[PDB]
């Protein structure tokens, strides 16, 4: 009967609604707000996780590790633009050698 399943999510609408008033973002939270927010986090979450597991699996292995996350974020134009000022610890950088440094 929980409201996450009532909106067909797998992130918690409750825990989110709570975090929302208990942060002081205003004094009153619409009943829609935590639903929606719960959703956007679930969508974005799946988008990274998918690009990630794809990277892991392309790279030999059954599970996603910080390398797979950093790969997934830095190859998608948009996710990378969202996470442009975030460091993924344990993640390394993407391969890039300037054309000029190349032989002959």
Partner DNA sequence: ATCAATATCCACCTGCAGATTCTACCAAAAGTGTATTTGGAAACTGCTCCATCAAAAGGCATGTTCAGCTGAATTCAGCTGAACATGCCTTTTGATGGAGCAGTTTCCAAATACACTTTTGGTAGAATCTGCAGGTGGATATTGAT
30 lies in the binding site for other proteins (CB under 8 A): yes
Residue 34 contacts residue 17 (beta carbons within 8 Å): yes
Q: What distance in Å separates the CA atoms of residue 50 and residue 72, rounded to the nearest whole number?
A: 8
Q: What's the closest the beta carbon of residue 54 comes to other proteins, in angstroms? A: 8
The helix/strand/coil state of 51 is helix
Judged by CB, which is closer to DNA: 25, or 43? Answer: 25
The C-alpha angle 74, 79, 82, rounded to 5 degrees, equals 110
Q: Which does 78 bind (CB under 5 to 8 A by kind): other proteins, a second copy, DNA, none?
A: other proteins
43 lies in the binding site for a second copy (CB under 8 A): no
The helix/strand/coil state of 90 is coil
Binding site for DNA (CB under 7 A): 1-4, 12-15, 17-18, 21, 28-32, 56, 60-63, 103
């Amino acid at each position: 009967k929980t409201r996450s399943s009532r909106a067909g999510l797998q992130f918690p609408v409750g825990r989110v609604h709570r975090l929302l008033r208990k942060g002081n973002y205003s004094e009153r939270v619409g009943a829609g707000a935590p639903v929606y927010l719960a959703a956007v986090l679930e969508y974005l979450t799946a988008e990274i996780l998918e690009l990630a597991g794809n990277a892991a699996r392309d790279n030999k292995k059954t599970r996603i590790i910080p390398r797979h996350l950093q790969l997934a974020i830095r190859n998608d134009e948009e996710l990378n633009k969202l996470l442009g000022r975030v460091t993924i610890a344990q993640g390394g950088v993407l391969p890039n050698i300037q054309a000029v440094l190349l032989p002959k």
